[PDB]
Write a protein that binds this ligand. Structure first.
Ligand SMILES: O=C(O)c1cc(-c2ccc(CN3CCc4cc(-c5ccc(C(=O)O)o5)ccc4C3=S)cc2)n(-c2ccc(Cl)c(Cl)c2)n1
Length: 123
């Protein structure tokens, strides 16, 4: 409905990156999903997510959630609530957000557009 950006947890990306408290259950939009190079393990999916203010490309799906992607319930434009995530930090300092449990609140086809004008989150 009207005020589409009000459907998303504006500021959650910065909170996940700046404070790292995992108690929040933010509502985010999927902007894009792609496989990463895995070679010889289960496929792994990387997501570009939006909270309405920012996008962030550092999200990875837990492999237990792969069927959501592979059966097309989880695709570009859908709106999701994250019920469980963790943050991991690489040796080089970059952070990865692993999505463990999530719920699709609105399918891609029911939303249909990138909500708002989110900009990339910087480090
Ligand atoms: O081929 C490419 O294009 C590519 C390739 C990577 C790329 C490679 C390697 C890594 C390292 N790594 C790997 C898998 C992984 C899995 C889990 C985890 C916990 C629970 C579950 C589960 O149930 O599945 O999984 C927790 C931590 C990791 C980490 S730190 C990250 C990222 N990336 C990449 C680089 C930077 C970022 Cl910020 C991201 Cl999200 C991906 N891109």
């Amino acid at each position: 409905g009207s005020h589409m950006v009000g459907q998303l947890s504006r500021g959650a990306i910065a909170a996940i990156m700046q404070k790292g408290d995992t108690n929040i259950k933010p509502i985010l939009q999927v902007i894009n999903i792609r496989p990463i190079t895995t070679g010889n393990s289960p496929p792994r999916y990387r997501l570009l997510m939006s909270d309405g203010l920012n996008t962030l490309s550092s999200f990875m799906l837990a492999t237990q959630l792969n069927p959501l992607v592979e059966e097309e319930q989880l695709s570009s434009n859908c709106v999701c609530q994250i019920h469980r995530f963790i943050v991991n930090t690489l040796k080089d300092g970059r952070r990865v957000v692993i999505l463990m449990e999530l719920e699709v609140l609105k399918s891609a086809e029911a939303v249909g557009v990138k909500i708002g004008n989110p900009v990339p989150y910087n480090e």
